[PDB]
C-alpha cells in the first residue's frame, strides 16, 4: 500500500521502458487533473477517471492504476 502500488514490474509490462512510462503516466495525470478542474464548467474532451477512486486521491496514482489495469493506449505522433 502507498507509493509502491502498483508494482513497477507489473507497470513495465504495458510500456517499453521507465522513460516512456514516466511521460505516459504524467500525461494521463494532467488529463485527469484538467478534467477535475474544469468539470463544473462547459464539457471538454477530457474524460476519466476510469477506475474507482478515493475522497482526494492524487491524479498520478489514478493514472498509474489505469495504466496497470490496461485501460489506456499510447500512440506515436
Amino acid at each position: 500500500e502507498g507509493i509502491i502500488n502498483p508494482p513497477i514490474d507489473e507497470l513495465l509490462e504495458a510500456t517499453d521502458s521507465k522513460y516512456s512510462l514516466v511521460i505516459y503516466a504524467a500525461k494521463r495525470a494532467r488529463q485527469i487533473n484538467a478534467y477535475y478542474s474544469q468539470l463544473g464548467e462547459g464539457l471538454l474532451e477530457y474524460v476519466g477517471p476510469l477506475v474507482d477512486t478515493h475522497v482526494h486521491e492524487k491524479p498520478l496514482s489514478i493514472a498509474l492504476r489505469e495504466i496497470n489495469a490496461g485501460l489506456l493506449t499510447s500512440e506515436a505522433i
Binding site: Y24, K27, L50, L72, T73, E75, A76, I77
Partner: peptide, 14 residues
C-alpha cells in the same frame, strides 16, 4: 511525442 487516450472498450464500461 505520444498521445494518451482511453481504449474504446474501457470507455463503454464507464
Amino acid at each position: 511525442n505520444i498521445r494518451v487516450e482511453p481504449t474504446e472498450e474501457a470507455k463503454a464500461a464507464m
